[PDB]
Amino acid sequence: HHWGYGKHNGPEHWHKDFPIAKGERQSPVDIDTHTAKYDPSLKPLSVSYDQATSLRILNNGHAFNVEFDDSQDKAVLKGGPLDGTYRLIQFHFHWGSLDGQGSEHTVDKKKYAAELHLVHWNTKYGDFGKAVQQPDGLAVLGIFLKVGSAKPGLQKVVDVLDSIKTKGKSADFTNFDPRGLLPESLDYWTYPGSLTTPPLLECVTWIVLKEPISVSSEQVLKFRKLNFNGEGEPEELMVDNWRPAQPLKNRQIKASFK
Ligand SMILES: [Zn+2]
């Protein structure tokens, strides 16, 4: 009876195995645009992904992750509200069974079709495993996807999904450039939060971009053909792998723009 997104093991159940689920800095949250505070001291974000080295794509049973070589400062995030250098280790998505839902964060209660998470860890802690035990260990860049025109830069990911349909499958995925997934503007909202899947650790500085990317109907459709189950087990479509918005509690969302 492992955690998941079903009726008997879904998000409303995670607190029984992971108490922090009811913590003070849980993610995701609804981003009220009118109460977010513009903070002029926020620096622009610095994304340096030109030397990124993708290695593999893996179906881990709750999403698919594109993994990168994080043994050197090849793909890093600096600036914004961050102190120090954060290395990209993996990116993944959350999506819905319908185009009207799928994002984890919401903007004025609006839900997007999907949400991309670029996960980075603070080099000062030496490895991802140590970074998750710290309050400033991770920086996650969140990008919303809306259905419209196609995103050419995402097609390489969509085409390989047939080869990792079931949990535990992996495939070589080299020379993928994550710059093709960024929007034109890097304006963002930021708040202190957590991982949105177990262990739900409160170690994330969230950076959510204001500008969504558009993807085609057909591209998002291919995400919905993945399976939560392993090969040879009954088929359960990998859809609605998103956690609902959690209480903001004692936190303030800051905006880099007005
Ligand atoms: Zn995520």
Swiss-Prot record:
The entry's keywords: Acetylation, Cell membrane, Cytoplasm, Disease variant, Lyase, Membrane, Metal-binding, Osteopetrosis, Phosphoprotein, Zinc
Consequence recorded when altering V119 to A/G/I/L/S: Reduced CO(2) hydrase and p-nitrophenyl acetate esterase activities
Site label Fine-tunes the proton-transfer properties of H-64, positions: Y5, N60, N65
Record note on what altering N65Q does: 2-fold decrease in enzyme efficiency, as determined by kcat/KM ratio, and efficiently inhibited by chlorzolamide
Record: active site: H62
InterPro entries, A to Z: CA_dom (IPR001148), CA_dom_sf (IPR036398), Carbonic_anhydrase_a-class (IPR023561), Carbonic_anhydrase_a-class_CS (IPR018338)
Annotated consequence of substituting A63S: 2-fold decrease in enzyme efficiency, as determined by kcat/KM ratio, and efficiently inhibited by chlorzolamide
Class of the enzyme per the UniProt entry, highest EC level: lyase
GO terms under cellular component: apical part of cell; cytoplasm; cytosol; extracellular exosome; myelin sheath; plasma membrane
Subcellular location: Cytoplasm; Cell membrane
Annotated consequence of substituting E104D: Normal CO(2) hydrase activity
Residues annotated as domain Alpha-carbonic anhydrase: 1-257
Cofactor notes: Zinc. Can also use cobalt(II) with lower efficiency, but not copper(II), nickel(II) and manganese(II).
Modified residues (Phosphoserine): S163, S170
Variant or mutagenesis effect after changing H92Y: In OPTB3; partial loss of activity
Catalytic activity: hydrogencarbonate + H(+) = CO2 + H2O; urea = cyanamide + H2O
Outcome (variant: W3A): Impaired activity, not rescued by 4-methylimidazole (4-MI)
Residues that, per the record, bind substrate: T196, T197
UniProt effect for mutating T197S: Enhanced p-nitrophenyl acetate esterase activity, but normal CO(2) hydrase activity
The family this protein is said to belong to: Belongs to the alpha-carbonic anhydrase family.
UniProt miscellaneous comment: Target of drugs used in treatments against glaucoma disorder and breast cancer.
Complex and partners: Interacts with SLC4A4. Interaction with SLC4A7 regulates SLC4A7 transporter activity. Interacts with SLC26A6 isoform 4 (via C-terminus cytoplasmic domain).
Entry function: Catalyzes the reversible hydration of carbon dioxide. Can also hydrate cyanamide to urea. Stimulates the chloride-bicarbonate exchange activity of SLC26A6. Essential for bone resorption and osteoclast differentiation. Involved in the regulation of fluid secretion into the anterior chamber of the eye. Contributes to intracellular pH regulation in the duodenal upper villous epithelium during proton-coupled peptide absorption.
Protein name, entry field: Carbonic anhydrase 2
Native organism: Homo sapiens
